[PDB]
Amino acid sequence: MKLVRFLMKLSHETVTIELKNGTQVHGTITGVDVSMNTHLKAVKMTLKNREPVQLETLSIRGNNIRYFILPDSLPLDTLLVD
Amino acid sequence: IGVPIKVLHEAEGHIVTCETNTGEVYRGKLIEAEDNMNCQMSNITVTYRDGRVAQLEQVYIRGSKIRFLILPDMLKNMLKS
Amino acid sequence: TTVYEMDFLADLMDNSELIRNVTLCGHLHHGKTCFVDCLIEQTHPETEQERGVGIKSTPVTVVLPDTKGKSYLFNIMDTPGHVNFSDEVTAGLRISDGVVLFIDAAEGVMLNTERLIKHAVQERLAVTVCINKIDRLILELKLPPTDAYYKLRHIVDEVNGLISMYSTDENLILSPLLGNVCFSSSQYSICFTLGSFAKIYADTFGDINYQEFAKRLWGDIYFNPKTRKFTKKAPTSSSQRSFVEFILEPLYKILAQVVGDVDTSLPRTLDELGIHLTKEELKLNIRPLLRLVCKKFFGEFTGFVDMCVQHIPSPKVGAKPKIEHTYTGGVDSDLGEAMSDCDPDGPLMCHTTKMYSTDDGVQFHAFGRVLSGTIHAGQPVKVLGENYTLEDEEDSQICTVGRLWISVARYHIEVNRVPAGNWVLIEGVDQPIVKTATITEPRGNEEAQIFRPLKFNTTSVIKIAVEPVNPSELPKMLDGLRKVNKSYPSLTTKVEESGEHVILGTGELYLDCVMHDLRKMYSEIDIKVADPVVTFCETVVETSSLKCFAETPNKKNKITMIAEPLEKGLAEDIENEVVQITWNRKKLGEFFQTKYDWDLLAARSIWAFGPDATGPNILVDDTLPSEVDKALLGSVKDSIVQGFQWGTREGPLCDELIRNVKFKILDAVVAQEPLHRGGGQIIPTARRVVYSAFLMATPRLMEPYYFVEVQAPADCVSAVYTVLARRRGHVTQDAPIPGSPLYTIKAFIPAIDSFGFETDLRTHTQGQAFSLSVFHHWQIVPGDPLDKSIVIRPLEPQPAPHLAREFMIKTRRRKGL
Amino acid sequence: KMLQHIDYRMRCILQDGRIFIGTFKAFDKHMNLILCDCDEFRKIKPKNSKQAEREEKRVLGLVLLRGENLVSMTVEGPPPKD
Amino acid sequence: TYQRWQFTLPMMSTLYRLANQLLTDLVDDNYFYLFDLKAFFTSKALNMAIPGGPKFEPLVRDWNEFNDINKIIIRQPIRTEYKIAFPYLYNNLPHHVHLTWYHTPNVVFIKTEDPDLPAFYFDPLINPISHRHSVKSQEPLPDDDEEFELPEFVEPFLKDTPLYTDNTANGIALLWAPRPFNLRSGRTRRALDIPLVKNWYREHCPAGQPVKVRVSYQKLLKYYVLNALKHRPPKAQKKRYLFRSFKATKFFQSTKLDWVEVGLQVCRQGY
RNA sequence: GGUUUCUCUUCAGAUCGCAUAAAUCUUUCGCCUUUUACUAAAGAUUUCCGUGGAGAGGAACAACCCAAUUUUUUGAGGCCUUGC
Ligand SMILES: Nc1nc2c(ncn2[C@@H]2O[C@H](COP(=O)(O)OP(=O)(O)OP(=O)(O)O)[C@@H](O)[C@H]2O)c(=O)[nH]1
Ligand SMILES: [Mg+2]
């Protein structure tokens, strides 16, 4: 229903996120909030047309997200239950 | 009401710098700052994207179309939060 | 006969502003443990047992989120609540930075809460309160919400009284308004602060401010609906204080529906609340249902977190408060600064205030709070015993580190290294330590000082002799005894001349489990045990008539010394350290002169406090024309002091500690340039001198007394009185407990007569009364210890008028002879 | 997740691609940010670029940034003690 | 199959009230301090009796120093309840000893008397509060006049819901009941395994009872404890069935009769 | 894909079945004239009354507040020239 709630459950997962500005972010989710503001650790972030930089922590304003690529393993049917 | 907004209202009567969404840079006295960041200023110096300057007596800029503001350092000394 | 995040755990450990050490405490059975249990349930959906009484404290490290979603690392010491075991609580308190005390709502503040508040405040720790078991005001006492508010306020008031009692500065007073107070029920996983409850209102509803709301809920503030603004009461109508209107009333309503209904109307109430449950969940039994529903409504367990995060300083602040008291140097030039910064660096430092056993083997892992730097597996470390000082190389052993561990409740997480601020188990530094020890950089240059060894709230009093059945097994038993000395903090052992091996404990329960540990685990050997008896101290009630003066073994020196009693307050102050020795003669004399009308000259004449640096006894020199041969006097003075200390440590009557006595020198005869003659002969002489003064004028015995708090129904108060009469007890105060159908009886009782007291009380009341008892007070035994006209029947208990003789003689027969 | 980084030095990325580094002192619902002793960089975020670390650096001072134009934030350095 | 019942609270409260004559009024566990099973086990092993508890065959059956009288101080003499309370302290050579000693906090429970009297009122048996102490103190009280004001809508969590209901008190009392009454659902049990009077003989210290019956109470405890001590799990299991074998074979037929009629038939058959 | 009761097969009792039987063997006691039948505690073992878990099959009952102009549900997307 409110799918941000689903994303809020993904703490401690590792994901790849593609941004609206084309930037690619790979790291481990420490927290998603209600605005889809996403916080990560152990982050390898590749701005479009750069080599990656590694950051111990990164915090993304939710609106700037295009999409999350989730772990293949992820048990969606579990997570979609409320 | 947001903490940064209170600090902005505190800068009313001070000289501040404002950059718009289009990168024009307006420096002068902040007369009034609204809750939505709408800004009334006076005796402005404007520095365009080409580098040229101009002078204006009175301006008012919509909050949404502001990228940021520079405030005095007189304010820095809201440390509670 | 935790892979994914431990990394996460390590990250949290590293930072040192995301970690806090906190302590749960409060009176017996007020629900500290179920709270933690229920917390753990949320966190991981993945002798004590048999008794049901906490005895040994447990260290638990966990990762917890605040109301803003920021994670912290908490180090939690779950102490025991039984008053006999307060020793482990002190261990905990040395290690930690702040303390959480929760008082069961339906019980009120009780004995051990009071003692612990006192103690933690004196240890300069930060104090917060969780009130547990608020469910008992509803489901059990069935108070109106209004009345429950009153009760809660009363609790707060009582704790503030206690706190103010012992803190010079009211920097801290606790009110849920300030964020110092949980209202919880661990059983039903309800736990909230006034603020975090406001979060619930906001998040279900609209924009309304989280903090401005919260600050206006507790305390005789009312809410006018018309105004839409909270007000100091202007509605004469009668509207419940807003804590009731917005919190307790709806809390009652939630609980009432679930217990009361659960079928008829419970589901709709849940829709109003915004709690969806499944059919399975709604078929549950009512207590589990309550817990379920409140878990949905009331969040993870936020309030504890927020309180701790805001009010406990954290380690970063850590050392400077910690460094002052703990460290003998106390800081100044080097190490004290080093400890204070707390950054892993430099020497490394550790403080060991526990020895958690391993059941299987002799060896146990030690536990302590890493003060500065960091420990690594296999690093060689240097042990410092409590005894070791700056230039006492002998006591300082070294060994390596087998494994490092981080302790979740009864789980051992292996790790490679541990940074400053965190607690840690160290394997391999066990054999060379006894009780308190500090860990230092091993065979690396630096120099070190040891942290003051543990001070305890209580005094150990109850004495038990132990002896193995077969003499050939003796060494095994001895080994076992060593192990329990490490296992328990105040547990004190000694071997007294007869070969009798003696254990000193705090009370019956304690000692029972000490014996249990000894026989069952540490040595399989069959062990005889003597009947429990207390220690006695020796004192004087009047100035000596005449003064025996002993010539030295070398017939060269003579010392004329008298003895007389101290006005009570003196000895009590001397020990508390309020009057302590360190201050310059100027300061010391000022204190005594000012407080007790002490003579200026007498003040000047003060030399030492005898047996302990803080000890009841005082040594004073007054012979003015003859005294002013100070140089000679000075030469011998220190040896006299050592004689004094030794003589008061050891006893002329029962070979026990001398208490509350002033020794006063009248005539110093010393051989001109006393030589080695004076140096060596005087100490033995001085001990003689002390005894001679004491015995000649006018000894008595001191028996320890316990303070007793009894909880009991009205019908059985008389029975309590009866019991105490039987045991020579006497009652102090008898009063009903506000808001709850029980009476509290405070009383005293002699230590000897305390054996079996609890159990006889409980038996006569059919398990309605319950008694806690803790050492509190020394007091003179009624008779005259030295009276040969008294004939003692060998087994028959004597009358009070000559208990002193009985005690004296039997104790001497036991060893002194 | 925001309150943790408060008082710290923070590297903030704008929607045009600028880099604002300042002391993170306050935020709000919109992620409007208060940045003390703030400088702006354009060309690079240095990871020890042997040629130079700093080109087109500008001293700004006390900055209020509107959240609309914020993309992301990482920890740049610890809090100054002052 | 008549397993697993699940009722409403109202049903439970009605049943409870019907059952009152057979039911224990003890809400805490403190009554049974040294009258529980652990104490009995200890008592057995040490060959002791707690005044009104069960006695037992003794579990099994040279001069020493501590024992000596001259060195012994006696103020109060070491009674057997102490030996059981703290059996590793006051007792040499303990074996097979369990640890009594737990605090079951005192249960304070108010029986309601009358229907009026809302389920939440201060009963005369409580002790009135009267908070009394020092001055209150001060707190960064944010005086108004500054600014701020709720945007409007939000209100206390449950507003239309009343605090209490006609079933509230009964629902709460279901929380403190002996075992069968505290639950909405359960599993059906055989009538044989429902010993209605177990909690009558487990009573702690009656007095005013003719010697004869006090002995009977003592003997019932002895059976109780022995059963608990003896309780091996089955230890090995087979699910063999008799009537199913008989019934599957043509020589048996099945029907339904009056119990009485069957009884008569059995007596004739036995004759 | 959901819910309910019949049948079979498989597996498990470290505190349980908020209850409590019988039997075998090996010991000390107690009856004592012999053997059974027995006394009453301990230890080692089984049988029985119930019970959980897993799978398969069959049957029955339903059924195919917070995205609308000042921030967080985008006005963004794309192309080319100039400068060492
Ligand atoms: N009525 C009621 N009883 C509770 C509640 N929480 C706990 N209890 C009971 O009160 C007792 C306290 O639980 P514990 O957690 O074991 O108490 P404690 O804090 O461990 O006390 P210590 O022996 O000192 O450790 C338990 O026997 C619980 O059954 C509650 O919320 N309501
Ligand atoms: Mg506990």
Verify whether the Cβ–Cβ distance D34 to B7 is below 8 Å: yes
Give the pair of three-digit tokens for residue C334: 């080097």
Chain C: touching chains (3 or more CB pairs < 8 Å): A, D, E
Q: What distance in Å separates the CA atoms of residue C250 and residue C297, rounded to the nearest whole number?
A: 12
CB contact at 8 A, C755 and E82: yes
Closest CA to B23 of D33, D14, D29: D14
Chain A: touching chains (3 or more CB pairs < 8 Å): C, D
| Ramachandran assignment for C179, one of left (phi > 0), alpha (psi -120 to 50 degrees), beta (any other) | left
Give the pair of three-digit tokens for residue C163: 């706190």
Atom of ligand 1 nearest to the CA of E103: 23
Question: What is chain D's alpha carbon radius of gyration, rounded to the nearest angstrom?
Answer: 12
| Cβ atoms within 10 Å, residue C652 | 20
Length of chain A counted residue by residue = 82
Closest CA to E30 of C708, C762, C135, C509: C762
**Separation of CA C347 from chain center:** 31
| Cβ atoms within 10 Å, residue E92 | 18
Q: So where are chain D's domains?
A: 1-82
| Cβ atoms within 10 Å, residue E117 | 11
Collect all residues with Cβ–Cβ distance below 8 Å to C523 and sequence separation of at least 6. C476, C477, C479, C480
CB contact at 8 A, E41 and E229: yes
- The partner residues of C169 in beta bridges, in order of sequence, read none
CB contact at 8 A, C569 and C596: yes
Q: List Cβ<8 Å contacts ≥24 apart for C808-811.
A: C808/C653, C808/C654, C808/C701, C809/E70, C810/E70, C810/E71, C810/E72, C810/E73, C811/C536, C811/C654, C811/C655, C811/C656, C811/E71, C811/E73
Residues of A in contact with D14 (CB under 8 A): none
State this model's resolution in angstroms. Answer: 4.9
CB contact at 8 A, E106 and E26: no
d(CA C239, C1' F30) / Å: 78
Q: What distance in Å separates the CA atoms of residue D63 and residue B71, rounded to the nearest whole number?
A: 6
| Cβ atoms within 10 Å, residue A17 | 22
Question: Which residues, chain by chain, have CB under 5 Å from ion ligand 2?
Answer: C 33, 54
Alpha helix stretches (DSSP H) within E47-190: 80-85, 168-173
DSSP one-letter string for E18-41:
HGGGG-----SS-SSSTTSHHHHH
Which secondary-structure segment (H or E) carries C750? strand C743-750
**Separation of CA C450 from chain center:** 21
Closest CA to C685 of C668, C660, C661: C668
Distance C544 CA to ligand 2 centre (A): 53
Verify whether the Cβ–Cβ distance B4 to D60 is below 8 Å: no
Q: What distance in Å separates the CA atoms of residue A81 and residue B12, rounded to the nearest whole number?
A: 51
Collect all residues with Cβ–Cβ distance below 8 Å to E30 and sequence separation of at least 6. C762, C767, C768, C770, E104, E105, E106, E107
Q: What distance in Å separates the CA atoms of residue C177 and residue C288, rounded to the nearest whole number?
A: 31
Q: What distance in Å separates the CA atoms of residue E230 and residue E208, rounded to the nearest whole number?
A: 33
Verify whether the Cβ–Cβ distance A21 to D15 is below 8 Å: yes
| φ and ψ at residue C171, rounded to 5 degrees | -60, -40
Q: What distance in Å separates the CA atoms of residue C80 and residue E57, rounded to the nearest whole number?
A: 38
Would strands C606-608 and C618-621 be described as parallel, antiparallel, or unpaired? Answer: antiparallel
Distance C104 CA to ligand 2 centre (A): 12
User: Which domains can be identified in chain B, with CATH numbers?
Assistant: 1-81 (2.30.30.100)
Q: Which amino acid is at C552?
A: T
Collect all residues with Cβ–Cβ distance below 8 Å to E112 and sequence separation of at least 6. C142, E119, E123, E169, E173
Give the pair of three-digit tokens for residue D9: 């030095």
Nearest CA to ligand 1 atom 20: C33
Closest CA to C772 of C455, C507, C535, C460: C507
Q: How far is D15 from chain C, CA to nearest CA, in Å?
A: 26
- Strand F bases within 7 angstroms of protein beta carbons: 5-6, 8, 11-21, 28, 40-43, 45-52, 65, 69-74, 76-77
Q: From residue E155, how far is each of B65, C197, C205, E24, E212 by CA, in Å?
A: 36, 13, 7, 45, 67
CB contact at 8 A, C353 and C370: no
Does B14 contact D at CB distance below 8 Å? no
Mapping DSSP to helix (H, G, I), strand (E, B) and coil, where does residue A41 land? Answer: strand
- The partner residues of E68 in beta bridges, in order of sequence, read none
Collect all residues with Cβ–Cβ distance below 8 Å to C527 and sequence separation of at least 6. C466, C467, C468, C469, C477, C515, C518, C519, E92
| φ and ψ at residue C22, rounded to 5 degrees | -135, 160
**Residue C136 CB less than 6 A away from ligand 1:** yes
CB contact at 8 A, C511 and C532: yes
May I ask the CATH architecture of the domain A1-82?
Answer: Roll (2.30)
Does B64 contact D at CB distance below 8 Å? yes
**Residue C54 CB less than 6 A away from ligand 1:** yes
- Going through C626-684 in order, the beta strands assigned E by DSSP cover 661-669
Q: Identify the residues numbered 134 to 173 in chain E whose C-beta atom is closer than 7 Å to any atom of strand F.
A: none
d(CA E190, C1' F17) / Å: 11
Alpha helix stretches (DSSP H) within E89-160: none
Residues of D in contact with A31 (CB under 8 A): 1
| Cβ atoms within 10 Å, residue C612 | 14
Residues of D in contact with B76 (CB under 8 A): 36, 62
- Cβ burial of C272 (10 Å; 0-12, 13-18, 19+) is middle
**Separation of CA C743 from chain center:** 26
**Separation of CA E268 from chain center:** 46
Mapping DSSP to helix (H, G, I), strand (E, B) and coil, where does residue E257 land? Answer: coil
d(CA E215, C1' F34) / Å: 37
Q: From residue C296, how far is each of C107, C123, C132, C182, C270 by CA, in Å?
A: 28, 39, 19, 18, 10
Closest-CA residue of chain B to D29 = B2
**Residue C32 CB less than 6 A away from ligand 1:** yes
DSSP category for residue C430: -
Closest CA to C741 of D46, E106, E62: E106
Residue A55: half-sphere exposure toward Cβ, Cα within 13 Å? 27
Give the pair of three-digit tokens for residue C574: 């001397």
Q: What distance in Å separates the CA atoms of residue B9 and residue B16, rounded to the nearest whole number?
A: 12
Residues of C in contact with D3 (CB under 8 A): 68, 70
Mapping DSSP to helix (H, G, I), strand (E, B) and coil, where does residue C325 land? Answer: helix
Torsion, Cα C159 C165 C169 C173, to 10 degrees, reads: 10
Closest CA to C418 of C449, C372, C450, C352: C372
**Separation of CA C114 from chain center:** 11
**Separation of CA E55 from chain center:** 23
Which secondary-structure segment (H or E) carries A67? strand A65-69
Angle in degrees, CA C746, C749, C752, rounded to 5: 155
